[PDB]
């Protein structure tokens, strides 16, 4: 009776943006990113990719409630670098890693078949 | 109101208007009073003193400033080139950025005096 | 070179040039609305601390337009008092409040029980509460302010 | 179309001027308006006249 | 007769919690019924928050009449009672 | 069980005014004596000038005054706590305010409670 529709976990409403970025003025060069219709699958990947960058000084995420499909990320970088650029570099790096992983898997599957 | 207008000046709150306008105008008034060519007495006494000083020192032109009692926030610039010249009175308005004389903004009293002398030289 | 303390020239400020000396130095808070306005924008105060053998002389400046012609003066700033107004920072070294508040100590004085302004909560500034009735806590609030200022001074390795 | 009645407004049989004066006074009473003082909260604000 | 002169008032000079709750409720109801506000509201809209702001600045125009067990009473203004 | 925790107030004053280090105190003994004596006559439970009111007021605060005098003794203040003038005045004001806040409120339905 009060159960939400299951497609609401991944279908984005028209008036709800996929991504909202606000600065965190408490510390310098920090932003707060709100991801809509996402969960731990993207969050943990992005967090542990960003945590290995020398110019990233802080990265974390939290899912506030399991009944709502969203998470919020906090990202803080060095003075020279901007946090959004670090996020873009992380996304590109993971895409490249997945590309070479898929290539090697296809090669090995063709070899063994 | 969210927007306050004082002439061409635009402000966003009462405190901003106060600090940017009234304090600066008061500072300009204090600078005008502390200037050597100022006299706070009545206009007739200012004219008499200017006439006497011009008669005694007719080799130079003398200019003095006084309060505009009829128009608040203004000043009368009375200058007499020589005893044979009639006393001419000019209007100076106390603005936050300085003093407005002949549609020209002068940041300080000395700059105002220099501009007045330059205008007199150009008009001569 | 004595350090500089910058106050908000706004009339709504609880700390103004009229009562800054009696508050920060003497430890007694008086209502600035009832006190007459101070004509001088520069004042000198003395702070006695257990961290230092000798009293420290500090300069209090209300308006930085006529006193900060040189960039080296900003190196002496150890505290900034703001009223949550954006227009305070038009002529400052960092016209954006955020960078200024990460690079300088910001203090906001409010009466106890009043709601914090939205801009104040979004900035990195300390909040100090003065009770409307009880007057014994003024020394405690002044001690918190001076603890922050002395921590900044020791971190800057100032010589006195 | 307001005057839907054929009232005999003959000048010799109708008091035109009194009707005009009464109608003008009724418009001058429809011009009446309500007004009240303003209250502002500010430390340097005082509800005083210019001379005050 | 039943009124008690202001010089010999012996009740507590502090606003109790019941008086604070009742005063806030009454002032919020009056504000929600279009009563003039005596403080400058920046962006506040909730009547209870405006009433709390009025209370913090001692601008609530209400009087508390405290009843003694014998029937007499003392009148205290909201602006002369200490509120924490 | 008594009101106004004195140990907490004393350690709060020590933390606030940095009462560490072997620095000598400027708190004179008559100041201590008169401050404690005056504090023990401002703990108002009942208001009024009637003699019965004063007798009831003195009766109601006997145990608490014993506690305060036992803690805020001259030798104890000078040696164990090492208060200074500002700390002493802060402690006195705090004790008075907290005692005022611990009184029962008229209108309480203490029978049902």
Cβ–Cβ contacts within 10 Å for residue C82, how many?
24
Length of chain B: 124
Angstrom distances, CA of residue B83 to CA of B64, B76, C33, F66, F74: 15, 19, 53, 94, 87
Residues in contact with B107: Cβ distance below 8 Å, sequence separation at least 6, in sequence order: B97, B98
Closest CA of chain D from C16, distance in Å: 14
In D, minimum Cα distance to C13 occurs at D43
Closest to C136 (Cβ–Cβ): which among F18, F21, F90? F90
Closest to C11 (Cβ–Cβ): which among B12, B15, B20? B15
Q: What topology is assigned to A1-113 in CATH?
A: Gyrase A; domain 2 (3.30.1360)
**CA dihedral of A7, A12, A16, A20, whole degrees rounded to 10:** 120
Chains B and F touch (3+ CB pairs under 8 A): no
Partners of C11 on chain D (C-beta within 8 Å) are 43-44
Provide the chain E residues 19-78 that lie in CB contact (below 8 A) with chain C.
42, 49, 53, 56
Longest CA–CA span in chain C (Å) reads: 43
Q: Check if the beta carbon of residue A21 is closer than 8 Å to that of residue A31.
A: yes
E strands in chain C? 4-6, 42-47, 56-61, 77-81, 106-111, 126-130
**Residue B84 backbone phi and psi in degrees, to 5:** -80, -15
Report the run of H or E that residue B65 belongs to, with start and end: strand B62-67
- C31 Cα distance to chain centroid: 16
C133 contacts E56? CB cut-off 8 A = no
Residues in contact with C72: Cβ distance below 8 Å, sequence separation at least 6, in sequence order: none
C11 contacts D44? CB cut-off 8 A = yes
The sign one gets for the Cα dihedral B45, B50, B51, B53 is positive
E strands in chain A? 19-23, 30-36, 56-62, 70-77
Provide the chain F residues 23-62 that lie in CB contact (below 8 A) with chain E.
47-48
Angstrom distances, CA of residue B90 to CA of B10, B29, B105, E64, E71: 28, 17, 15, 64, 78
DSSP class of B19: I
Asked if C33 is an interface residue toward chain D (Cβ–Cβ < 8 A), one would say yes
**CA dihedral of C96, C115, C38, C65, whole degrees rounded to 10:** 0
Closest to C11 (Cβ–Cβ): which among B12, B18, B20? B18
Alpha helices in C36-127 (DSSP H): 97-103, 118-121
Radius of gyration (Cα) for chain F, nearest Å?
A: 16
String of DSSP letters for E8-25:
G--S-SB--HHHHHHHHH
Residues in contact with C108: Cβ distance below 8 Å, sequence separation at least 6, in sequence order: C81, C82, C83, C84, C116, C120, C125, C126, C127, C128
CATH superfamily of the domain spanning E1-84: RNA polymerase subunit, RPB6/omega (3.90.940.10)
Cβ–Cβ contacts within 10 Å for residue F24, how many?
7
Residue B45, token pair as written in the block = 């006494």
Angstrom distances, CA of residue A57 to CA of A53, A77, A93, A100: 8, 5, 18, 28
Asked if C114 is an interface residue toward chain E (Cβ–Cβ < 8 A), one would say yes
Asked if F101 is an interface residue toward chain E (Cβ–Cβ < 8 A), one would say yes
- β-partners of residue C80 are C6, C106
C123 contacts A28? CB cut-off 8 A = no
Residue D18, token pair as written in the block = 């009194």
Closest CA of chain C from F81, distance in Å: 17
C111 contacts E56? CB cut-off 8 A = yes
Distance CA B52, CA B46 (A): 10
Residues in contact with B1: Cβ distance below 8 Å, sequence separation at least 6, in sequence order: none
Domain ranges of chain A: 1-113
Asked if C11 is an interface residue toward chain D (Cβ–Cβ < 8 A), one would say yes
Closest to F18 (Cβ–Cβ): which among C50, C134, C139? C50
- Structural determination approach: cryo-EM
A28 contacts C102? CB cut-off 8 A = yes
Residues in contact with A87: Cβ distance below 8 Å, sequence separation at least 6, in sequence order: A33, A46, A50, A75
Report the run of H or E that residue B94 belongs to, with start and end: strand B88-95
Q: Check if the beta carbon of residue B123 is closer than 8 Å to that of residue B85.
A: no
Alpha helices in B6-108 (DSSP H): 14-17, 23-34, 43-56
| Cβ burial, residue B15 (10 Å; 0-12/13-18/19+) | buried
Asked if E67 is an interface residue toward chain F (Cβ–Cβ < 8 A), one would say no
Partners of C12 on chain D (C-beta within 8 Å) are 43
Q: Three-class SS of residue C26? A: coil
Distance CA C1, CA E35 (A): 57
F47 contacts E11? CB cut-off 8 A = yes
Distance CA F107, CA E67 (A): 10
Provide the chain C residues 9-68 that lie in CB contact (below 8 A) with chain F.
27, 50
Resolution in A: 3.6
For chain B, the chains sharing at least 3 beta-carbon pairs closer than 8 angstroms are C
In F, minimum Cα distance to E15 occurs at F105
Report the run of H or E that residue E28 belongs to, with start and end: helix E17-32
Among the listed residues C128, C30, C135, C136, the one whose alpha carbon sits nearest the alpha carbon of residue C79: C128
Among the listed residues A86, A74, A81, the one whose alpha carbon sits nearest the alpha carbon of residue A21: A74
Q: What angle do CA D23, D24, D25 make, to 5 degrees?
A: 90
Report the run of H or E that residue A95 belongs to, with start and end: helix A83-112
DSSP class of C54: S
Distance CA D41, CA D48 (A): 14
- β-partners of residue D8 are none
Domain ranges of chain E: 1-84
Q: Check if the beta carbon of residue C130 is closer than 8 Å to that of residue C111.
A: yes
Q: Which residue is it, tokens 């208060």?
A: F83
Q: Check if the beta carbon of residue A40 is closer than 8 Å to that of residue A63.
A: yes
Closest CA of chain C from D41, distance in Å: 12
Distance CA F106, CA E74 (A): 14
Closest to E56 (Cβ–Cβ): which among C114, C117, C133? C114
Length of chain F: 113
Render the burial of A17-55: b for 16+ CB within 10 Å, e for the rest: eeeeeeebbeebbbbebebeebeeeebeebbebbeebee
Report the run of H or E that residue B67 belongs to, with start and end: strand B62-67
C12 contacts B16? CB cut-off 8 A = no
Closest CA of chain C from A86, distance in Å: 21
Chains C and A touch (3+ CB pairs under 8 A): yes
Partners of C102 on chain A (C-beta within 8 Å) are 25, 27-28
Report the run of H or E that residue F32 belongs to, with start and end: helix F29-39
Render the burial of D4-32: b for 16+ CB within 10 Å, e for the rest: eeeeeeeeeeeeeeeeeeeeeeeeeeeee
Distance CA F13, CA F87 (A): 6
Distance CA E31, CA E21 (A): 15
Distance CA C21, CA B103 (A): 43
In B, minimum Cα distance to C40 occurs at B27
The sign one gets for the Cα dihedral F2, F3, F6, F11 is positive
C27 contacts F86? CB cut-off 8 A = yes
The sign one gets for the Cα dihedral F35, F37, F38, F41 is positive
Q: Check if the beta carbon of residue F47 is closer than 8 Å to that of residue E12.
A: yes
Chains C and F touch (3+ CB pairs under 8 A): yes
Chain E interface mutation, best of C132, C134, C135, C137, highest count of E Cβ atoms under 10 Å: C132
Residue B104, token pair as written in the block = 């020209």
A25 contacts C101? CB cut-off 8 A = yes
């Amino acid at each position: 009776m009060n159960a939400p529709d299951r497609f609401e976990l991944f279908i984005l409403p028209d008036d709800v943006p996929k991504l909202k970025i606000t600065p965190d003025s408490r510390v310098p060069n920090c932003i707060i990113i709100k991801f809509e219709r996402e969960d731990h699958t993207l969050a943990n990947l992005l967090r542990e990719e960003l945590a290995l960058y020398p110019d990233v000084t802080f990265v974390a995420y939290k899912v506030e409630h399991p009944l709502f499909a969203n998470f919020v990320m906090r990202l803080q970088t060095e003075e020279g670098t901007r946090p959004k650029q670090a996020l873009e570099r992380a996304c590109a790096s993971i895409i490249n890693k997945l590309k070479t992983l898929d290539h090697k898997f296809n090669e090995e599957w063709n070899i063994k078949n | 109101g969210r927007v306050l207008l004082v002439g061409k000046y635009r402000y966003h709150d009462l405190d901003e208007l106060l600090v940017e306008y009234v304090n600066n105008v008061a500072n300009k008034v204090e600078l005008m009073v502390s200037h050597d060519k100022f006299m706070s007495d009545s206009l007739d006494y200012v004219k008499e003193w200017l006439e006497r000083y011009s008669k005694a020192n007719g080799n130079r032109s003398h200019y003095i400033f006084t309060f505009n009692r009829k128009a608040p926030g203004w000043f009368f610039l009375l200058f007499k080139l020589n005893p044979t010249s009639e006393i001419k009175i000019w209007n100076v308005k106390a603005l936050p950025d300085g003093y407005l004389l002949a549609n020209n903004v002068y940041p300080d009293t000395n700059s105002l005096c220099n501009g007045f002398k330059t205008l007199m030289s150009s008009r001569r | 070179k004595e350090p500089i303390i910058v106050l908000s020239p706004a009339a709504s400020s609880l700390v103004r040039m009229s009562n800054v000396k009696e508050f920060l130095q003497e430890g007694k808070f008086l209502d600035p609305s009832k006190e007459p306005a101070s004509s001088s924008n520069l004042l000198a105060i003395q702070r006695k601390s257990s961290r230092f053998k000798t009293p420290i002389k500090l300069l209090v400046v209300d308006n930085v337009e006529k006193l900060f012609t040189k960039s080296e003066y900003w190196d002496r700033v150890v505290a900034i008092v703001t009223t949550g107004k954006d227009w305070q920072f038009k002529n400052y070294k960092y016209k954006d409040p955020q960078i200024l508040f990460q690079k300088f100590n910001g203090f906001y004085f409010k009466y106890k029980g009043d709601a914090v302004p939205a801009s104040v909560k979004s900035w990195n500034v300390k909040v100090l509460d003065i009770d409307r009735v009880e007057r014994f806590s003024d020394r405690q609030v002044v001690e918190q302010f001076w603890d922050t200022v002395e921590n900044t001074l020791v971190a800057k390795r100032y010589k006195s | 179309q307001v005057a839907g009645l054929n009232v005999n407004r003959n000048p010799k049989f109708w008091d035109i001027e009194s009707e005009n004066r009464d109608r003008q006074e009724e418009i001058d009473k429809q011009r009446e308006e309500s007004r009240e003082s303003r209250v502002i909260k500010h430390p340097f604000f005082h509800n005083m006249k210019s001379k005050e | 007769e039943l009124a008690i002169l202001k010089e010999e008032r012996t009740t507590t000079p502090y606003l109790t919690k019941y008086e604070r709750a009742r005063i806030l409720g009454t002032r919020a109801l009056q504000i929600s019924m279009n009563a003039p506000v005596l403080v400058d509201i920046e962006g506040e809209t909730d009547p209870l928050q405006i009433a709390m702001k009025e209370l913090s600045q001692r601008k609530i125009p209400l009087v508390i009449r405290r009843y003694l067990p014998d029937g007499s009473y003392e009148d205290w203004g909201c602006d002369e009672l200490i509120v924490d | 069980p008594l009101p106004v925790n004195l140990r907490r107030i004393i350690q709060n004053a020590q933390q606030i005014f940095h009462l560490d280090r072997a620095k000598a105190s400027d708190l004179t003994i008559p100041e201590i004596i008169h401050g404690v004596r005056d504090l023990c006559k401002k703990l108002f439970v009942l208001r009024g000038e009637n003699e019965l009111i004063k007798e009831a007021q003195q009766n109601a605060t006997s145990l608490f005054q014993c506690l305060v005098r036992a803690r805020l003794a001259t030798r104890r203040i000078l040696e164990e706590f090492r208060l200074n003038r500002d700390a002493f005045e802060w402690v006195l004001g705090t004790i008075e305010a907290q005692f005022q806040r611990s009184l029962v409120h008229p209108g309480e339905m203490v029978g049902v409670i």
